[PDB]
Design a protein around this ligand. Sequence first.
Ligand SMILES: O=P(O)(O)O[C@H]1O[C@H](CO)[C@@H](O)[C@H](O)[C@H]1O
Ligand SMILES: [Ca+2]
Ligand code: NA
Ligand code: NA
Ligand code: NA
Ligand code: NA
Ligand code: NA
Ligand code: NI
Length: 572
Amino acid sequence: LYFQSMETNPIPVVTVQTTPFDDQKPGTNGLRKKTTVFESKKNYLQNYIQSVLSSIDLRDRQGCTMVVGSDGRYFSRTAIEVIVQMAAANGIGRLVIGHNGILSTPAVSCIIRKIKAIGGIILTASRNPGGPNGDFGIKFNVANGGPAPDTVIDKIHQVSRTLEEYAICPDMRIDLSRLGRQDFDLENKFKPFRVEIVDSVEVYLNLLRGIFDFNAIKGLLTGPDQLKMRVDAMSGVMGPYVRRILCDELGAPANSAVNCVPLEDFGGHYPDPNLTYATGLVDAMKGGEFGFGAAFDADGDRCMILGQNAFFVNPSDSLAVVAANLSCIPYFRQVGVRGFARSMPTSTAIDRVAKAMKVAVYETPAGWRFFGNLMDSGRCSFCGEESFGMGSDHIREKDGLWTVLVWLSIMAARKQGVEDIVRDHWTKLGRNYFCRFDYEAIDPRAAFYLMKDLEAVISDKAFCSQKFAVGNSVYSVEKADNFEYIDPVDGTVARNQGLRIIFSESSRLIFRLSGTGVGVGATIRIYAESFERDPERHNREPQVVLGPLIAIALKISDIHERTGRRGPTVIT
Ligand SMILES: O=P(O)(O)O[C@H]1O[C@H](CO)[C@@H](O)[C@H](O)[C@H]1O
Ligand SMILES: [Ca+2]
Ligand code: NA
Ligand code: NA
Ligand code: NA
Ligand code: NA
Ligand code: NA
Ligand code: NI
């Protein structure tokens, strides 16, 4: 098929010889390194961008569209520039980029799916700190808008470890500050290379408007009896989303929007929503003047929900509560509820809802990528993780602001505050007490032998006959395993996904090695769960209830001696 056209000042395409790197395999949620690795290690960033681009069939990449966005952290604008120069050189037809480089992770997923893009690159290190001395990360999402599957992660890795050259258009300059279209004539490309700078919020907001009853939510946030609300974006990507959606569209006063200017260092604070790091929000909620509080992580897919007086909504309870109240949402009234999913370490509170509702519930490895197949196949429409994550099949990522809007929708439909809804839920279904200990940046050698030895302990043929006593508490082993998951849709097998001990007395211990590290150090997470049926025992301190289970965990793992630590780095 023949065509003729004109070109003006075509941008040359440069081929650069390079040496492969050894460690360019992404973890659970992207390739995460210290920022200085991407910024200063020669060709480190270019090698990985080329490897990502090369995991796309050359015929499927010619004339395709990719979405690019960042959480705003230091080095994002430089990475975006390089990404645009390299996408142009590798024959990508069009890039859709958020205004000023800003696109939340839920917005990227939404836009990929909406415009049928082949995929997306999200520049974020999630809850990790930003700045020149901070962390930087590169996520790759595929055509369903969800994280890259193990199939694609391996293709990226084998391209990165053997890469010998990459292509780039170094003379290209892109203005992220102006909305609209920018076309570029490239040498040896017939069609112009197209860049669209899009409003960070508009298309994502349009999706949310069809899921939720915005009139109902607006009624809750306005008028004389209005909900008093504090929403902390932690100086990350969610700033403009909060202001445009919760304030402008839904009527919340401007003082509801806290830390809603994106900053390259997130204001010098960890953009991590929990009681340990969202101290500014907790302190304001403790004052008693607000009925609802929320904090988001850097890229807007995590959310902590607080009630009046900083009542803490455990993320595993958030999952169960919302699951039991999906009828309050227009979306789920129309399309129904096909199934639930949680990660294996997440508490089994949602399983009790699924049983009562006669709905399937799946148990996946940690990480949102495993919910993608469940949603695509229609097996599941609502899912969550203990790590402050919740989402639905509206996209293929977790979604913090969606979590806020579904909670407000439930509060409006039930005419109840946060704490009353949760306690009413506990009264109906019982309470699953739950906590997580993080042992951060421990020696990888120590972690290896710890997990190896513990696996041998819990896999011994006599372990299911064991029982443990701490004080007056007794726990009897029902089952134990090294969790594996065979994807029911595409057959991907994920092994070594957590050491799990299930006790007969409605209790669990889970041990996992982290897969989202940046540097050398390893992180071990211990999860403890205990179910309480008695409604008079639903106001105890979780660290008291779970004390004995934690004692057993620390003893059989020997973690304190093996790591030199006296206790966990973080408690959730
Ligand atoms: O470091 P980990 O435990 O492998 O992974 C952690 O971050 C992931 C990416 O946000 C979450 O999906 C997990 O639930 C969380 O535990
Ligand atoms: Ca037993
Ligand atoms: Na040209
Ligand atoms: Na700083
Ligand atoms: Na079902
Ligand atoms: Na109430
Ligand atoms: Na993480
Ligand atoms: Ni995140």
